[PDB]
Amino acid sequence: SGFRKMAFPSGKVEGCMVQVTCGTTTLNGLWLDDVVYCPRHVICTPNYEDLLIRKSNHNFLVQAGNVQLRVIGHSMQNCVLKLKVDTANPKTPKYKFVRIQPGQTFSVLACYNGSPSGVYQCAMRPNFTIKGSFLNGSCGSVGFNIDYDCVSFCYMHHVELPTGVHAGTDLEGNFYGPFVDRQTAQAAGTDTTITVNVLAWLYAAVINGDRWFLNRFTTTLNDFNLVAMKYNYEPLTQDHVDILGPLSAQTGIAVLDMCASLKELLQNGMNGRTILGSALLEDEFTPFDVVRQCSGVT
Amino acid sequence: SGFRKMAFPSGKVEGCMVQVTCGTTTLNGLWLDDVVYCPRHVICTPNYEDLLIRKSNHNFLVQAGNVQLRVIGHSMQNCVLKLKVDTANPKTPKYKFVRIQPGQTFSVLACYNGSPSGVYQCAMRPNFTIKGSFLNGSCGSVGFNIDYDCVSFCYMHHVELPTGVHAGTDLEGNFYGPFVDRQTAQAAGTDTTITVNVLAWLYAAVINGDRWFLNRFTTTLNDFNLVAMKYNYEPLTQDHVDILGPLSAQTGIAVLDMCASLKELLQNGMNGRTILGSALLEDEFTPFDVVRQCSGVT
């Protein structure tokens, strides 16, 4: 029992983190096989093609712990740089580059100067930002999920937006959302609450014995989505209902019966109660996150 | 910017986790040098000295991944078993066994069948329980902090109490709190809120631009502690004030001025606002946790 914001074990990613320096700019890179991936803004001191043509392999200092890696080639792929090095990382895990959807979660290994500092969980917001914890020097830190032995890398950190939320790319160098690795007035757009995740977390609450918000009522999908729209919640789809199936079965509470609980919570608040130790409705746990934690996969 | 529940990178601990089986009971062990540490309740099927005298080395099956470790000796140290094995763990980090105080935080690497599943942060409660996330098979999972290259192990998981909170030992096998590794009606005592940590988190909020709860007032330590007692908060000491010094300096808000903010929040609530994304006062971040995250140590 219990329910925590739980990250994946970070060891497989720690062995991949290196430091990349170009000029006076130092940030983090990801060393997989004989390539180091890092944000292309490491070469700034704003046409990146010009900036990179002016660089040579020797302008990139790559440090893996106490070992300096020799750069033998460099190329740009969207907003990431690929630095080919003369040695393949012996600690390279089985890995994939996967782009995630808004609403999905991942673990972040925050690093500075190539050294891992901490690991935490977060979600891709509907507005394509993440509410991370990053300080200067954290660029190049990565987000990932782990399945069996395979690390699925989904995020590389590039930018802090004016509200203090964060933006970045997939590992192919393509930004999540309408953000750029340049100096503009860019800002996060309006965000919404991830409805399917709130429902998942209410199921986690029930599994853990918080039942006070339950009721005998059941709503219809259309009737619930009318309320979701009013409270700035994402629409709930039949696919979302199907995805919640396993949790609905385990608790014996139909999805649309839980939706009636959510409707009431939205219209009346909590009346001073808490759910899983929170006084707000939590939306950064996916259905998979709940199953994983209330079943125990390793 | 941003502020997350952030665990230490778990790699150094992952390389130490093994599976220990005795009879039909399987749980986790910690393999450091040529010793595997695990909960002594692995030998149950309630005088532990008798139970262990009846066992032999061959009754303990220890698996480190795909490798079976041969047990060459066994002894009991308080509530932990020490299984001497014929091979020293080549991945043993620099480590220490340190017992923590209520109010202090640590990272938990939850494991099942010797395999790490997730990592999260938690605090030792004033009542010596932890609000963890553990399922069947998680016994023997460990809690730790990391400083530079050194893993300070502080917790090993043994028991789930009736309210779903958790109890365990230090790595010398001594329980935190008045709990036992036997079947009794034991239950967590009344808990309190960790005041110094709430203040630390309010400083984190200020550092991150949440200032709405600030005021021009300053209270006295005695006057604040009168209010803390009424709201089931731990007393605040001059040492706590001194420990908060660095955060008070960085923000320019004196500790007793922040105490005036806490007093108001306790007496009036939040009026529908949030602090660092929470509608409750958070007490599971120490002053060190705040400095570490709002400064960037690795």
Q: Do B7 and A111 touch (CB under 8 A)?
A: no
Cα radius of gyration rounded to whole Å, chain A: 22
Q: Which two tokens stand for residue A264?
A: 């009431």
Q: Which residues of B touch A146 (CB under 8 A)?
A: none
For the CA atoms of B290, B291, B293, B296, the dihedral, rounded to the nearest 10 degrees, stands at 180
The residues facing A32 across adjacent strands are A35
Q: Which residue has the tokens 């192919």?
A: A172
Q: Which two tokens stand for residue B64?
A: 């480190």
Q: Do A135 and B296 touch (CB under 8 A)?
A: yes
The yes-or-no answer on residue B139 being catalytic is: yes
The yes-or-no answer on residue B154 being catalytic is: no
Q: Which residues of B touch A277 (CB under 8 A)?
A: 131, 280
Residue type, B105: T
Spatial neighbors of B258 by CB under 8 A, at least 6 apart, are: B199, B202, B203, B244, B248
Cα distance between residue B136 and residue B64, in whole Å: 20
Strand duo A115-123 + B17-22: pairing: unpaired
Q: Which residues of A touch B117 (CB under 8 A)?
A: 9, 292, 296-298
Sheet containing B25-32: which strands, arranged edge to edge?
Answer: B67-69, B60-64, B17-22, B25-32, B35-39, B80-85, B71-77
Q: Which two tokens stand for residue B144?
A: 């730790």
Cα distance between residue B117 and residue B105, in whole Å: 20
Cα distance between residue A98 and residue A105, in whole Å: 13
Q: If residue A38 lies in a helix (H) or strand (E), which one and from where to where?
A: strand A35-39
The residues facing B63 across adjacent strands are B19, B68
Select the CATH number that applies to the domain covering B92-169 from these four: 2.40.10.10, 1.10.3720.10, 1.25.40.10, 3.40.50.300. 2.40.10.10
Q: If residue A25 lies in a helix (H) or strand (E), which one and from where to where?
A: strand A25-32
Burial A20-56 (b: 16+ CB within 10 A, else e): bbbeeebbbbbbbebbbbbbbbbbeeeebeebeeeee
B274 conformational bin, left if phi > 0, alpha if psi -120 to 50, beta if neither: beta
Secondary structure, 3-state, A87-106:
CCCCCCCEEEECCCCCCCEE
Q: Considering the domain B13-85, what is its CATH architecture?
A: Beta Barrel (2.40)
Of A109, A113, A208, the CB nearest to B9: A109
Is residue A17 a contact partner of residue A114, using CB atoms and an 8 Å limit?
A: yes
Q: How many helices (H) and strands (E) does chain A have?
A: 8, 13
The residues of A assigned a catalytic role are 41, 139
Cα distance between residue A222 and residue B288, in whole Å: 49
Resolution (angstroms) stands at 1.5
Cβ neighbours around A248 below 10 Å, total = 18
Cα distance between residue A133 and residue A38, in whole Å: 19
Compare all CA atoms of chain A with the CA of B283 and give the residue at the minimum distance: A277
Q: Which experimental method was this entry solved with? A: X-ray
Is residue B149 a contact partner of residue B96, using CB atoms and an 8 Å limit?
A: no
Given this structure, which CATH class describes domain A195-293?
mainly alpha
Strand duo B150-160 + B166-169: pairing: antiparallel
Is residue B217 a contact partner of residue B265, using CB atoms and an 8 Å limit?
A: no
Cα distance between residue B250 and residue B242, in whole Å: 14
Residues spanned by CATH 2.40.10.10 within chain A? 13-85
CA A216 to chain centre: 36
Cβ neighbours around B91 below 10 Å, total = 15
Q: Where are the alpha helices (DSSP H) in chain B?
A: 11-14, 48-53, 195-207, 221-230, 238-243, 245-251, 255-268, 287-293
Compare all CA atoms of chain A with the CA of B273 and give the residue at the minimum distance: A280
* Dihedral pair phi/psi, residue A96, rounded to 5°: -145, 155
Q: Is B115 exposed, middle or buried (0-12, 13-18, 19+ CB in 10 A)?
A: middle
Q: Which two tokens stand for residue A187?
A: 């800002």
Residue type, B181: D
Secondary structure, 3-state, B251-274:
HCCCHHHHHHHHHHHHHHCCCCCC
Beta-sheet strands, E only, within chain B: 17-22, 25-32, 35-39, 60-64, 67-69, 71-77, 80-85, 94-97, 105-112, 115-123, 142-147, 150-160, 166-169
Is residue A41 a contact partner of residue A29, using CB atoms and an 8 Å limit?
A: no
Which residue of the set B111, B139, B154, B259 is catalytic? B139
Cα distance between residue B172 and residue A106, in whole Å: 35
Cα distance between residue B43 and residue A269, in whole Å: 49
Q: Which residue has the tokens 């952030």?
A: B6
Is residue B203 a contact partner of residue B253, using CB atoms and an 8 Å limit?
A: yes
The C-alpha angle with vertex A175 and arms to A173 and A176, in degrees rounded to 5, equals: 135
Q: Do A296 and B165 touch (CB under 8 A)?
A: no
Residues spanned by CATH 1.10.1840.10 within chain B? 195-293
Q: What is the DSSP letter of B175?
A: B
